[PDB]
């Protein structure tokens, strides 16, 4: 319901969608050749089929083609600075595909807006929907137009006859929350019966280890998940089932 929507919001009012408690199959995302730009930051594409996270955040918008390279950490640009920033330690996925067939009108489409001027930069994750006029001079505007005073928002104006430079592009970004809470989003892998007193290799919610399991009378805190006494090695685990 997110990769097939009829209409997408403007880049200045992007809407985020949260996804949790479901079994995901990312293969159909990377098997298909429809997408033009498919980038991953911090995680290999295939290995996503064997990982579990706590929640997934999806953001979607539409922008011109020449700026598809700007959506990346560390870059600077008008939309990158004034509309959508990225943290320097981002991990996730970025998908971008051409949508000239869905957002083009013969007379010109004027349903998309983008911000031109702003006093300062934004934080890595922020949203700006203020309609207050921007003042570049010294004389107060008093809510009216004038010299050195302009309306911030500006239109794009897509046309079907334009070249690849001005053609629209639909962009979605996926972010994961991990190493913070017990897993909620899972991958398709059927479980297996347990072993009590034998040395085996185990895979608990994506955490891979080797050794022998046992039952201990440890007063584990009910709201906690697992512990590590020292040397950054887990020793106590809780079975999800």
């Amino acid at each position: 319901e997110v990769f097939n929507a009829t209409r997408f919001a403007s880049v200045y009012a992007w809407n985020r969608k949260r996804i949790s408690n479901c079994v995901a199959d990312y293969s159909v995302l990377y098997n298909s050749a429809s997408f033009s730009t498919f980038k991953c930051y911090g995680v290999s594409p295939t290995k996503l089929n064997d990982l579990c996270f706590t929640n997934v955040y999806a953001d979607s918008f539409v922008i011109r083609g020449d700026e598809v390279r700007q959506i990346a950490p560390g870059q600077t640009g008008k939309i990158a600075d004034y509309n959508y920033k990225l943290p320097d330690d981002f991990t996730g996925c970025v998908i971008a595909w051409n949508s000239n067939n869905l957002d083009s009108k013969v007379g010109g489409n004027y349903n998309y807006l983008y911000r031109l001027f702003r006093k300062s930069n934004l934080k890595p994750f922020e949203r700006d929907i203020s309609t207050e006029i921007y003042q570049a001079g010294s004389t107060p505007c008093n809510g009216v137009e004038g010299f050195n005073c302009y309306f911030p928002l500006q239109s794009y104006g897509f046309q079907p006859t334009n070249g690849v430079g001005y053609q629209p592009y639909r962009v979605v970004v996926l972010s994961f929350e991990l190493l913070h809470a017990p897993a909620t989003v899972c991958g398709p892998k059927k479980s297996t019966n347990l072993v009590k007193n034998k040395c085996v290799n185990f895979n608990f919610n994506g955490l891979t280890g080797t050794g022998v399991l046992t039952e201990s009378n440890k007063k584990f805190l009910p709201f906690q998940q697992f512990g590590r006494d020292i040397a950054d090695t887990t020793d106590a685990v809780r079975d999800p089932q």
Partner: antibody
Framework: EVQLVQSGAEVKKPGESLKISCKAS????????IGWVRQMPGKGLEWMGI????????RYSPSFQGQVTISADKSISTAYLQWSSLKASDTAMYYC????????????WGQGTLVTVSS | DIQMTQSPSSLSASVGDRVTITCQAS??????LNWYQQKPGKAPKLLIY???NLETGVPSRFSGSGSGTDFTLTISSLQPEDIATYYC??????????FGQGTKVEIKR
């Protein structure tokens, strides 16, 4: 002033083949979506599929996938609709509609082709 | 999947009366609605292409409103030639969208 003209009403029998056409004039045929709608006597409507002739992109409703086929021809500015094997539950009225996917869809329709099947 | 409903199924009103019809949705659709009218034995015609925006070439006596899960269509002053069948169609996902059930409007004399 645009005009959509369909093909004549048809009668067939089970086990045969069929083809239906729809022609548009008065505008640039390569810049608008063409969709197909059906109505069975006495009941409501139900979309079947849509097609974009320029890039030649076809999309189908989940209920009617594989039982029909939709294609377009930009040389004569025409759209088609094809079957594989008819049965006793394919008699209906069909319309071809012109639309565009940002503001208005369903601006102009056709006449309505009537397809009958029996033995 | 999304299913819709209309109410009332059929109603009768006199000339010059005010008529209202309600379209209800299973879940949120965010003002993605279209209103269709079909006279007996003809092809449908567009009436309102959004929650409120009015199509060109339509008499001004028609109006529409609503949001969320409830939408209303109102006819202010009825006229003799306004006997037809009315439909409300939602369009959210790329191609799964469906019509309603239908409504019949009559006139007594």
């Amino acid at each position: 002033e645009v005009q959509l003209v369909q093909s004549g009403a048809e009668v067939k029998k089970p086990g045969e083949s069929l083809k239906i056409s729809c022609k548009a004039s008065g505008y640039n045929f390569a810049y608008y979506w063409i969709g197909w709608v059906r109505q069975m006597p006495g009941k409501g409507l139900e979309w079947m599929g849509i097609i974009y002739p320029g890039d030649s992109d076809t999309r189908y409703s989940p209920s009617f996938q594989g039982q029909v086929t939709i294609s377009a021809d930009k040389s004569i500015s025409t759209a088609y609709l094809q079957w594989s094997s008819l049965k006793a539950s394919d008699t209906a009225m069909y319309y071809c509609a012109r639309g565009e996917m940002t503001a208005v869809f369903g601006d102009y329709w056709g006449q309505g082709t009537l397809v009958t099947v029996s033995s | 999947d999304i299913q819709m409903t209309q109410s009332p199924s059929s109603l009768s009103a006199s000339v010059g009366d005010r008529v209202t019809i309600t379209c209800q949705a299973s879940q949120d659709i965010s003002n993605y609605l279209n209103w269709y009218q079909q006279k007996p034995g003809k092809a449908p015609k567009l009436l309102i292409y959004d929650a409120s925006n009015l199509e060109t070439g339509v008499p001004s006596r028609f109006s529409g409103s609503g949001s969320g899960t409830d939408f209303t269509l109102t006819i202010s002053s009825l006229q003799p030639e306004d006997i037809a069948t009315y439909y409300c169609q939602q369009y959210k996902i790329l191609l799964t969208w469906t019509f309603g059930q239908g409504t019949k409007v009559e006139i007594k004399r």
